[PDB]
Design an enzyme around this catalytic site. Structure first.
Site, mmCIF file in Angstrom:
data_model
loop_
_atom_site.group_PDB
_atom_site.id
_atom_site.type_symbol
_atom_site.label_atom_id
_atom_site.label_comp_id
_atom_site.label_asym_id
_atom_site.label_seq_id
_atom_site.Cartn_x
_atom_site.Cartn_y
_atom_site.Cartn_z
ATOM 1 N N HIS A 25 -7.123 0.433 -1.583
ATOM 2 C CA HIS A 25 -5.754 0.005 -1.835
ATOM 3 C C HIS A 25 -5.724 -1.231 -2.750
ATOM 4 O O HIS A 25 -6.352 -2.251 -2.445
ATOM 5 C CB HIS A 25 -5.038 -0.337 -0.531
ATOM 6 C CG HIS A 25 -3.698 -0.967 -0.733
ATOM 7 N ND1 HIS A 25 -2.587 -0.237 -1.075
ATOM 8 C CD2 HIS A 25 -3.294 -2.260 -0.670
ATOM 9 C CE1 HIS A 25 -1.551 -1.044 -1.173
ATOM 10 N NE2 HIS A 25 -1.953 -2.274 -0.927
ATOM 11 N N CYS A 66 1.643 -3.883 -9.745
ATOM 12 C CA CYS A 66 1.707 -5.096 -8.927
ATOM 13 C C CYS A 66 0.483 -5.119 -8.007
ATOM 14 O O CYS A 66 0.404 -4.326 -7.088
ATOM 15 C CB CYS A 66 3.022 -5.121 -8.151
ATOM 16 S SG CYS A 66 3.339 -6.631 -7.216
ATOM 17 N N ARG A 81 5.190 -1.943 -14.072
ATOM 18 C CA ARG A 81 4.672 -3.141 -13.411
ATOM 19 C C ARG A 81 3.646 -2.727 -12.376
ATOM 20 O O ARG A 81 4.006 -2.287 -11.275
ATOM 21 C CB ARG A 81 5.772 -3.949 -12.721
ATOM 22 C CG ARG A 81 5.205 -5.064 -11.854
ATOM 23 C CD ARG A 81 6.213 -6.036 -11.357
ATOM 24 N NE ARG A 81 7.326 -5.407 -10.655
ATOM 25 C CZ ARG A 81 7.530 -5.427 -9.343
ATOM 26 N NH1 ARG A 81 6.714 -6.062 -8.520
ATOM 27 N NH2 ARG A 81 8.600 -4.821 -8.834
ATOM 28 N N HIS A 95 0.902 -1.621 -5.689
ATOM 29 C CA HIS A 95 1.984 -0.684 -6.033
ATOM 30 C C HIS A 95 2.367 -0.780 -7.484
ATOM 31 O O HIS A 95 2.159 -1.806 -8.128
ATOM 32 C CB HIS A 95 3.234 -0.897 -5.155
ATOM 33 C CG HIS A 95 2.993 -0.572 -3.716
ATOM 34 N ND1 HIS A 95 2.544 -1.509 -2.812
ATOM 35 C CD2 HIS A 95 3.068 0.599 -3.040
ATOM 36 C CE1 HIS A 95 2.359 -0.927 -1.641
ATOM 37 N NE2 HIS A 95 2.672 0.351 -1.753
#
Ligand SMILES: [Zn+2]
Length: 130
Positions: A101, A119, A117, A104
């Site tokens: 992970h 992020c 974007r 996003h």
């Protein structure tokens, strides 16, 4: 994902924050991560497997509180996945090599470029000055 999962090793090497973010999809609080305002030339690597993910030249000022980029290094290094957690519908971004992970991706990025974007948690990355 090709990069071999070795949890005992990950827990030895990664910090608590690096581990929770990359393995449990935690989110570093805005304005607390190491790389949020970093402007140095270099490459942002997955903290887990070391794959090159983002260049400094793709990093920009979003004011959002995390490292933010308008494109990844190429179209293969990021895996995208729908994320329905926390009462929201979002697009999660992961390392395509190991599955970590990262953060996003949002459609409010630079209108004069990609409009994306990316992020990303600082704790998902390690910076190579270059
Ligand atoms: Zn990785």
């Amino acid at each position: 994902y090709p990069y071999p999962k070795d949890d005992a090793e990950l827990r030895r090497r990664l910090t608590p924050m690096q581990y929770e973010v990359t393995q449990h999809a935690a989110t570093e609080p805005p304005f607390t991560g190491e790389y949020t305002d970093t402007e140095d030339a270099g490459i942002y690597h997955c903290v887990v497997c070391g794959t090159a993910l983002f260049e400094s030249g793709a990093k920009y000022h979003s004011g959002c509180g995390w490292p933010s980029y308008f494109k990844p290094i190429d179209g293969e290094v990021i895996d995208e996945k729908m994320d329905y957690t926390h009462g929201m519908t979002r697009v999660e971004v992961r390392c395509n090599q190991c599955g970590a992970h990262l953060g996003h991706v949002f459609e409010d990025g630079p209108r004069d470029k990609t409009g994306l974007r990316y992020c990303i948690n600082s704790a998902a990355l390690n910076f190579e000055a270059k």
